[PDB]
Amino acid sequence: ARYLGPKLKLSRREGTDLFLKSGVRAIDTKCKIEQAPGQHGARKPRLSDYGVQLREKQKVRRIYGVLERQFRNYYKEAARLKGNTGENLLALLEGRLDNVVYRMGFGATRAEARQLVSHKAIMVNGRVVNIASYQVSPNDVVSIREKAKKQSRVKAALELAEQREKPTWLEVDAGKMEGTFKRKPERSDLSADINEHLIVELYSK
Amino acid sequence: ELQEKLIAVNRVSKTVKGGRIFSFTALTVVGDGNGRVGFGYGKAREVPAAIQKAMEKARRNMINVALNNGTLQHPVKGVHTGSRVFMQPASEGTGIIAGGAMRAVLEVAGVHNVLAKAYGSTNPINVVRATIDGLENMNSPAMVAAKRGKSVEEIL
Amino acid sequence: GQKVHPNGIRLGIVKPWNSTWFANTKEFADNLDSDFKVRQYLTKELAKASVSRIVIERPAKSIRVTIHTARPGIVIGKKGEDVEKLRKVVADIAGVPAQINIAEVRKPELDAKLVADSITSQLERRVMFRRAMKRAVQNAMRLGAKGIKVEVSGRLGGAEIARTEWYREGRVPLHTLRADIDYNTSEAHTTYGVIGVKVWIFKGEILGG
Amino acid sequence: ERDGLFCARIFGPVKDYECLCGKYKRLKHRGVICEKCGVEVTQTKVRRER
Amino acid sequence: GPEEITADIPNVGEAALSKLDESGIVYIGAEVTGGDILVGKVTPKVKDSSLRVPNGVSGTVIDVQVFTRDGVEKDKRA
Amino acid sequence: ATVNQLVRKPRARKVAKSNVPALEACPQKRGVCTRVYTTTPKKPNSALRKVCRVRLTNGFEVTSYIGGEGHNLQEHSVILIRGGRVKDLPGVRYHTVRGALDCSGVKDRKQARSKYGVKRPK
RNA sequence: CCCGCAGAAGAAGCACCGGCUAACUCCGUGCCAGCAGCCGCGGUAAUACGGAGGGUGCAAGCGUUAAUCGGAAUUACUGGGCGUAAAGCGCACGCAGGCGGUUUGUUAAGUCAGAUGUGAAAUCCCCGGGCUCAACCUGGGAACUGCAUCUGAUACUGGCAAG
RNA sequence: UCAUGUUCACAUACACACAAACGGCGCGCG
Ligand SMILES: [Mg+2]
Ligand SMILES: [Mg+2]
Ligand SMILES: [Mg+2]
Ligand SMILES: [Mg+2]
Ligand SMILES: [Mg+2]
Ligand SMILES: [Mg+2]
Ligand SMILES: [Mg+2]
Ligand SMILES: [Mg+2]
Ligand SMILES: [Mg+2]
Ligand SMILES: [Mg+2]
Ligand SMILES: [Mg+2]
Ligand SMILES: [Mg+2]
Ligand SMILES: [Mg+2]
Ligand SMILES: [Mg+2]
Ligand SMILES: [Mg+2]
Ligand SMILES: [Mg+2]
Ligand SMILES: [Mg+2]
Ligand SMILES: [Mg+2]
Ligand SMILES: [Mg+2]
Ligand SMILES: [Mg+2]
Ligand SMILES: [Mg+2]
Ligand SMILES: [Mg+2]
Ligand SMILES: [Mg+2]
Ligand SMILES: [Zn+2]
């Protein structure tokens, strides 16, 4: 149910940075970011339309840490919902609870955030929520409980987050270690490099 | 601003006393993303040359299409040798639901929301021929008003 | 069908010889051997300095070599360390007093040997043969060759079946003897084997001789 | 340096008709605003206007 | 990155380079006119930025001088 | 084509036969090897392809390919056959399943083991 | 369901990598052994067999087989054709049948409009709510394209009557 | 009048546009 393998490997394969490490050390220093993964990486065959779509999909999936069945389900729900399908899908992915904690900044990576959620460190509306796929809703306060409030990892994460760029759609208090999920983020607020449209087409062939 | 993309490149042969002579055919399609589309079919002994010829041909003899808000104006059929094509305007956000060649020509044209199907033969060259014919043979409400001698409000 | 060598078919007429000395039959073979040795040595040594044409001319028990090269500065070296060294080694190989001269190729895009060498180097370092060849022809044409032909042959792109491909530009009149056709050959020793390069450069039509 | 006195997303892009973050380099994208750095892809001439 | 002086200038053929020596400096006694390359400098990432004789002027190149930092290689015009 | 014609006698759906009619819409079936032998392939191939005529539980006498190198088959050997043709042999429509009732898995296979009934080495 | 204990501890495989189709190299064999959904591969340099490394795709699953619909406008009502590709009876006459120039009247069967009754609940879909989330459960709608009856319109088609 | 010819086996398959800049301090010419 989780990918258990090299992370910079995933990034190398995609091409982009998927943010699977904390970013203390640059990824170019941590790995050959230029060279593609494997014996035969230094070769670029020209990629078909299917291939390109697949690569982008892989990128997004790796970034968030969603396996295929779950991703497909997300897409179906997004399609069902009114409005633009790709936009909707991105919103759902952001909405995921692990992603929200990462945005707030209690986890250095999404992996870290997921671990915290799993281990029951995070309460949504004063209730320890355990599911990483838990959809957070608008106006939902989500907070670190005091036992995990003493975590040096959590405090380290906060420092890292302070370094990172803060999201407009959340509001987070570092001392209280609580953030209010004010609204589901808009596509302009999310990254432009993600071409959700390719994902939609792929799951619509 | 004249975005172009090559649909299909195919190798074809002629036979001579010696043996076989191979050559390549490149089907390209260019368009400005505001209505104007033009396709070109180049032939040369090697692929890059063929592609270049196709691009030049395509760049000239393009054709303007009355597009309504990034989609078709009404359901339109198109026929040619075997490739018979149907294409229907669809609501904003559906995206282009269209085959291969068809997708290319539409995309360069600048239509963002269509439901197409290629019936009959799906020979790239013919399907492009069909699609361009279909797109051209499509008038707007301005044009119909002009023809019938009425205002657009009377027609709606 | 198998074409005659344009230099050898043109010697005397429009083309000079790369060797100019007299010898009786007693000393003739030996002289030839010496030339072969020295030429082989010189090419081997100054392969990286791009060397187009060695011209040997020995009078009075002494050899005068003339190396035609695209970059003399690298052939001469600073202080003339390498020219001097070469002179002495050449002298030992020959067994006579040596004298090296160095001719500067001002138009190295119009030199068959040089073009072939460049193409071969690219081929060795695994560039796309077609692209390299095209670049070579275009460059020569731009520089102002009245024409150029290039042929490459064998295991192209590491393909199992060998084939020859050639590009021609301008006019390259092989049957006209008064046509100044520069010609040369080279071989790229790739991982898949030898790949032959032939290059013809039609400088123009000489009418004086 | 972004939000300094030259920031390409405050005033406009430096390159002739192409964006700073590198994501877009063709007139087809004319007037899109990126989400890598936030620049608007437009005439660099307008960098002297705004 | 660091520049080079050379005859291997990109995008220019022997039609101009005929007056440089093999190092990348004009021969003494070359007679020159507008647009002749006197010094074939090049810049990485390769850009042909080389000294050309300015428009209008003309003359005979009577001399050259060459100056180099410490820990840097000479060449046969040095 | 004329609506009247259609009304009189409407359009017949094209009843598609199965390419594995001895299975009778079963995913596999048991049978007894009446006879196991080798046979020559069809035209652009050379081989000695192993095949066995099998009396099925439901009466049918089929012939079945036996994939993999080497096999423990002979007369009176109960095996399971599955759907799939060998394009290569004329008239052979069924594969034996390696790794069932009375067929061993292939020896020393490290890949596609699941396809050849081979257990995971350690 | 909550609380406490210890310690990364008890917990990753399956298929595939010639094209379609995302993913390539070396060794072994030498039209043999074998592979295969299609096209094909293998006769001494196998990216197609077998092994290895590397990669790709799914993941507590992954493959194979069977089966249905889709793609298949390949039974074509929507939505096919018949000179030469499969397809015009050898030619006629003709009953049942199908279709019917033009005008007026009447009828109101078809047709159309409106209403009433019904079309069980579950399912599908929408907005909600409850299981930590989901699956799942669930409130209310919508839908259930139908059918029946009654009351209207006379355009068209049908009946009857006259031209 | 003048028949027949064993089996298989045929690759090359992608950037456009862009030509020197702003202030002191001087000297000199008109
Ligand atoms: Mg699961
Ligand atoms: Mg579909
Ligand atoms: Mg001869
Ligand atoms: Mg054979
Ligand atoms: Mg591929
Ligand atoms: Mg082998
Ligand atoms: Mg296999
Ligand atoms: Mg072999
Ligand atoms: Mg294969
Ligand atoms: Mg294999
Ligand atoms: Mg159908
Ligand atoms: Mg038909
Ligand atoms: Mg016939
Ligand atoms: Mg007939
Ligand atoms: Mg007839
Ligand atoms: Mg009538
Ligand atoms: Mg009647
Ligand atoms: Mg009625
Ligand atoms: Mg709920
Ligand atoms: Mg009901
Ligand atoms: Mg009537
Ligand atoms: Mg006979
Ligand atoms: Mg024969
Ligand atoms: Zn940008």
From Swiss-Prot, chain D:
Chain residues that bind Zn(2+) 1: C19, C21, C34, C37
Role summary: DNA-dependent RNA polymerase catalyzes the transcription of DNA into RNA using the four ribonucleoside triphosphates as substrates.
Record text on subunit structure and interactions: The RNAP catalytic core consists of 2 alpha, 1 beta, 1 beta' and 1 omega subunit. When a sigma factor is associated with the core the holoenzyme is formed, which can initiate transcription.
Family: Belongs to the RNA polymerase beta' chain family.
Record-given protein name: DNA-directed RNA polymerase subunit beta'
Residues of the full protein shown: 52 to 101 of 1407
UniProtKB/Swiss-Prot annotation, chain E:
Complex and partners: The RNAP catalytic core consists of 2 alpha, 1 beta, 1 beta' and 1 omega subunit. When a sigma factor is associated with the core the holoenzyme is formed, which can initiate transcription.
Family according to the record: Belongs to the RNA polymerase beta chain family.
Functional note: DNA-dependent RNA polymerase catalyzes the transcription of DNA into RNA using the four ribonucleoside triphosphates as substrates.
Protein name per Swiss-Prot or TrEMBL: DNA-directed RNA polymerase subunit beta
Record organism: Escherichia coli O157:H7
Upper taxonomic lineage: Bacteria, Pseudomonadati, Pseudomonadota, Gammaproteobacteria, Enterobacterales
Originating gene: rpoB
Full-protein interval shown: 846 to 945 of 1342
